[PDB]
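Table S4 entry, PCB4scFv(hN56D).
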Amino acid sequence: MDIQMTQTASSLSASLGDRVTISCRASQYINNYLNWYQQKPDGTVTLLIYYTSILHSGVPSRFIGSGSGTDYSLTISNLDQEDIATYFCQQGYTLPLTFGAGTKLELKEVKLVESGGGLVKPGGSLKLSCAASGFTFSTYGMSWVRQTPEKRLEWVASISGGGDTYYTDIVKGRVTISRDNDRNILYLQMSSLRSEDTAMYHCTRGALVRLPHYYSMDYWGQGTSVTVSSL
């Protein structure tokens, strides 16, 4: 069964300079294959920590990731204005990749550009594009990740450099991930869209962490919006 990631708190209140720890629990063993992401108030998502404790480039040592088994934590010391954001944990141990619901913090070269979103009625269709630059697009795995209006992150699909495809169950047979390695574009053709497919759709780059199938999503595009409504 799917691994459920639980962030018990949805927001934590603190003062500048404080130390705060965000908890994240996995419903089963994930072999420390835990990633942390940061979403600024304007919606920008970046990779913060991967493999439980390894910092992404550009992330200061004020962020400490820790844990094992099913209990993991993100400790931020000397809280700064730039840390006011939402933090998501994500297991990369088995498919489907699953995210926690996020915990907000409140006070007391690589380019990815999405397009093709829009408004459709149920049963409609769209095709999303993701233009990549600043790296060798053909050697990297790529994914689509959507954020619902409830702010939940849901992995949609992944594609290897060679073209192998993987989907989350609820979109199988209704979306198709594909890539053009000459023009460096990632695609997602959507069909028979349902109201619950309404979300902001991000394309992400998969960086290999550990063989054979452990990846982090080290770079995120700004996203393109899909709205499916009967009105």
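Residues 168 and 224 are 19 Å apart (CA to CA).
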